[PDB]
């Protein structure tokens, strides 16, 4: 029997508020564990000691609440800069069990994207392939749609997107969609268009170019 700790993940809030995260303990543990802050693409940093005695070098926003089981952390008066996951552990015992991690989102309001379409560089068309990039800059609701169209034909299954972590300054997202074609197939059509749908747009925005027009 090992302990299996659990967490109600995927939080979403606004700044200056109260939020509270609990950590189950599916066995009788005592009162010695720890919380960590894992910013994305970085190393963890422990906040709560082996109970609630918050380790030094931290602000006054965290309040670890300890018990026999069902431990619980609480953030009051949020600040835009805590974009990361929070884990549980369990000191003392050698092989320790870890949590499941809770990402926490940060609500904003309404901010449409700047859109921009980039045709393939002349160097790449030598190589024999065409990447067509479309960029969506800064934007709260990430539930954006990127529809590629080639000569007004909606393109399915030759694109890839990725999205950035919520920005620590202005709490926005940015998205890059890449359409990949062969040189041969690229040279068979004229208008390349990228149509972005988003809540901050009253009707969708299309940025487009015409292959071969300086």
């Amino acid at each position: 029997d090992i302990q299996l700790t659990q967490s109600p993940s995927f939080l979403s809030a606004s700044v200056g508020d109260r939020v509270t995260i609990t950590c189950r303990a599916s066995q009788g543990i005592s009162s010695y564990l720890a919380w960590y802050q894992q910013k994305p693409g970085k190393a963890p940093k422990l906040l709560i000691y082996a109970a609630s005695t918050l380790q030094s070098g931290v602000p006054s926003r965290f309040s670890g609440s300890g018990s026999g089981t069902e431990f619980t952390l609480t953030i009051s008066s949020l600040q835009p800069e805590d974009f990361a996951t929070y884990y549980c552990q369990q000191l003392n015992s050698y092989p320790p069990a870890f949590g499941g991690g809770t990402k926490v989102e940060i609500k904003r309001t309404v901010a449409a994207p700047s859109v921009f379409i980039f045709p393939p560089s002349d160097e790449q068309l030598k190589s024999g392939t065409a990447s067509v990039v479309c960029l969506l800059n800064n934007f709260y609701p990430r539930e954006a749609k990127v529809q590629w169209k080639v000569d007004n034909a909606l393109q399915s299954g030759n694109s890839q997107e990725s999205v950035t972590e919520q920005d620590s300054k202005d709490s926005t997202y940015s998205l890059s969609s890449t359409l990949t074609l062969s040189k041969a197939d690229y040279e068979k059509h004229k208008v390349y268009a990228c149509e972005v749908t988003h809540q901050g747009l009253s009707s969708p925005v299309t940025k487009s170019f015409n292959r071969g027009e300086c």
């Binding site: 720890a34 960590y36 970085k42 190393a43 963890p44 940093k45 422990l46 000691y49 082996a50 380790q55 884990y87 552990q89 000191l91 050698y94 092989p95 320790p96 870890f98 949590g99 499941g100 991690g101 700047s114 859109v115 921009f116 379409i117 980039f118 045709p119 393939p120 560089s121 160097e123 790449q124 190589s127 990447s131 990039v133 960029l135 800059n137 890839q160 997107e161 990725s162 999205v163 950035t164 940015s174 998205l175 890059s176 890449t178 990949t180 940025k207 487009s208 170019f209 300086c214």
Partner: protein, 217 residues
């Protein structure tokens, strides 16, 4: 105070091997509980091994055997000599100084794929254009594609521009190679005016190329 740095990650196939050196930048690795923490990408953490100030091992469950930890106090180095990697550990490795809890633990990567490409970039500049221009600002960037060895970096002007510079997560194609594109916005009055050169560095290989992005012809 203490600024643990680690080195030794790369790429290898099963039955391979690899020594990792948790270089104790900072003091007294002779008398501290040290450990290795592992996480696969998109996953939670996992614990690997631990050394006592006095010498003991206690390896983890699945990596029981086939995996060796040691220290060197006079060099202030922790040594992790592994071998016969089931390639199922392809993970991001951390070494942390357990001080009654943990904390103080650097970072370091590894991948154990059953192949090798190790090639490097295919860089193109994505020019600033009126289709990207809107009012006061316009965006330009660099597309770095088709590379296997995951850790790759693109900076703007040798690290100068930090405003608007946003590198998007790399994408894994069906071909098996990664690709990404990093873009930055800059006032539309400044399309070609100043320097905007993306510095592409591929650390598993030794690729270093600077590409200038200029408005479309």
């Amino acid at each position: 105070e203490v600024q643990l740095v680690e080195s030794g990650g790369g790429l290898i196939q099963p039955g391979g091997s690899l020594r990792l050196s948790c270089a104790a930048s900072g003091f007294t690795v002779s008398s501290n509980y040290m450990s290795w923490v592992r996480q696969a990408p998109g996953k939670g953490l996992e614990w690997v091994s631990v050394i006592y100030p006095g010498g003991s091992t206690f390896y983890a469950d699945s990596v029981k055997g086939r995996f060796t930890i040691s220290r060197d106090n006079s060099k202030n180095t922790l040594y992790l000599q592994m071998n016969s990697l089931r390639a199922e550990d392809t993970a991001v490795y951390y070494c942390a100084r357990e001080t009654l809890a943990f904390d103080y633990w650097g970072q370091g990567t590894l991948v154990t794929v059953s192949s090798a490409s190790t090639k490097g970039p295919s860089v193109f500049p994505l020019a600033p254009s009126s289709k990207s221009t809107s009012g006061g600002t316009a965006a330009l960037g660099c597309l770095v594609k088709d590379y296997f060895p995951e850790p790759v970096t693109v900076s703007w002007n040798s690290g100068a521009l930090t405003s608007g510079v946003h590198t998007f997560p790399a994408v894994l194609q069906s071909s098996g190679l990664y690709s990404l594109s990093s873009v930055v916005t800059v006032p539309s009055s400044s399309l070609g005016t100043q320097t905007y050169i993306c510095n592409v560095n591929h650390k598993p290989s030794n690729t270093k190329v600077d590409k200038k992005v200029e408005p479309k012809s």
